[PDB]
Amino acid sequence: MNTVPFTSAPIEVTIGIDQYSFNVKENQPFHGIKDIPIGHVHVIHFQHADNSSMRYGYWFDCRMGNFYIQYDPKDGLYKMMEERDGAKFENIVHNFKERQMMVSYPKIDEDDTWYNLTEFVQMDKIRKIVRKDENQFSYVDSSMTTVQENELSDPAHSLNYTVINFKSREAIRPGHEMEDFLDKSYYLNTVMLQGIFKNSSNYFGELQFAFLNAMFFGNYGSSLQWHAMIELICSSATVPKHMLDKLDEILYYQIKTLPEQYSDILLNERVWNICLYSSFQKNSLHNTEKIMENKYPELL
Amino acid sequence: GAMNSSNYAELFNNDIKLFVDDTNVYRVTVHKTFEGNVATKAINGCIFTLNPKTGHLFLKIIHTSVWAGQKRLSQLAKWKTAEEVSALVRSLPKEEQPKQIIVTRKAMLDPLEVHMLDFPNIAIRPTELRLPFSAAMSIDKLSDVVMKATEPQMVLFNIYDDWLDRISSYTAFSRLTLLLRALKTNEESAKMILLSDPTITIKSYHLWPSFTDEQWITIESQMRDLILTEYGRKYNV
Ligand SMILES: CC[C@@H](CN)c1ccccc1
DSSP states (O other): OEEEEBSOOOSOEEEEETTEEEEEOTTOOOOEEEEEOTTSOEEEEEEETTEEEEEEEEEEOGGGOOEEEEEETTTTEEEEEEOOOHHHHHHHHHHHHHHTOSEEOOOOTTOOHHHHHHTTOOHHHHHHHBOOTTOSSEEEETTOOBHHHHHOOOGGGOBOOOOOOSSSTTTSOTTOHHHHHHOTHIIIIIIIIIIIISSHHHHHHHHHHHHHHHHHHOOHHHHHHHHHHHHHHHTOSOOOHHHHHHHHHHHHHHHHHSOGGGHHHHSOHHHHHIIIIISTTTTSOHHHHHHHHHHOTTTO | OOBOSTTGGGGGSSSOEEEEEOTTSSEEEEEEOTTSOEEEEEEOEEEEEEOTTTOEEEEEEEOGGGGTTOSOHHHHHHHHHHHHHHHHHHHSOGGGSOSEEEESSGGGHHHHHHHTTTOTTSEEEOBSOOOOGGGGGGSHHHHHHHHHOSSOEEEEEETTTTGGGTSOHHHHHHHHHHHHHHHHHOHHHHHHHHHSOTTSOBOTTOSSBOOOHHHHHHHHHHHHHHHHHHHHHHHTO
């Protein structure tokens, strides 16, 4: 069980850790989050009470270092940092555990939600999408644009998701135009899976990361990426059975977790109706179809 | 974006462009079988690819053999159209290739865009104009070459004959669309108007009769009367 200590909380803020959140008042004696499950990536995120513009946060894995949050009054945000002095960090984390100035990661024992949303998400792949190699953790916010969005502006602050474009030479073999456009299996299996991602685990990891950035930060380019990766699978007539079954589980837990009130803006009507009712895989996503129809029958 | 009445003179500027109409690519006759079911029999079709500035018509004849053993022919026909337009463009010298292709039916956009990925600078556009190019098969010489084809074939025509020696492209296109609209609304009457006077003939190298400027004005009036007549017959007005 790992800990992220906080030097203070000088401004009122809603703090998120994974799917949990809590309000901290200005100058409230808050000194961090304990009992964080080892074995998963995690995301600690922020929304200031006085400007809900810019949700921002940090993806991290406590196995890779000792991390803390400190407010920067010049840049005006809570920053993640890495403490290299292990003794000092353990000493500080103990003092606070003793003074009970930390909230506890509130994981119910039955509850596999976070695992189910991050099953294929690996910190090493996050760090290739979010490029800042001097840190072991990765900053994301509401406003960051994707490489594909930049093509259609600061590259250092971009989300380097894998570019998917259904009307591109990469997606369409010369001489197989109609075939490849109407059945995207060659783009999915040869170009993307064998060529770029190497395996379906890496593909799902990027899909899951894109959803979580869409949900936690309202990051629009991330939402576009999540839907494109869904649509590429659903628009392929030949998909391994284990991938379809896993995709159904992945999407089920995503739809389950999505705030009911944010469905209007985070769910693309065209993609979902196509995927569930028109696509090659329209009968292969039973769990997802059932939860969608019972939770969001309007969208459909 | 889309082509409409606001940007109509764009058709006659000096940027090479082509209209593509796919409405006569996949043509069938529907008939009863011996068992009393219904079946279709394909007949030869054509892509109508037209430069509205010069009158040059690239008529790609679609022979029924291209459908043999294929499924979902109405979908395939849009992709076959796109394949043939892409091949046409690739066959042209660079300075003759179009800068824009305007499709008359929006279902052609994705097929054509996908076939033209090698040409990122050629704009593929829809139009809000309702153009009567489906009536091209009412032009006798075009219908004849299509129905007589025994294999795929490309035939080149100038659909304006020699009109551009006397009138502008804008006026030539307006005459062409008036004639085709009339032929689409009442083909028998339209063809009667065009041929009722045997002293005016169609040159061997032409599609339409050799009307004088004054005769064209009369013909054009009779075509507007025909279109208004049919509009009244139709809607009871
Ligand atoms: C252990 C790192 C120091 C700041 N360098 C600190 C102080 C208080 C709380 C958390 C972290």
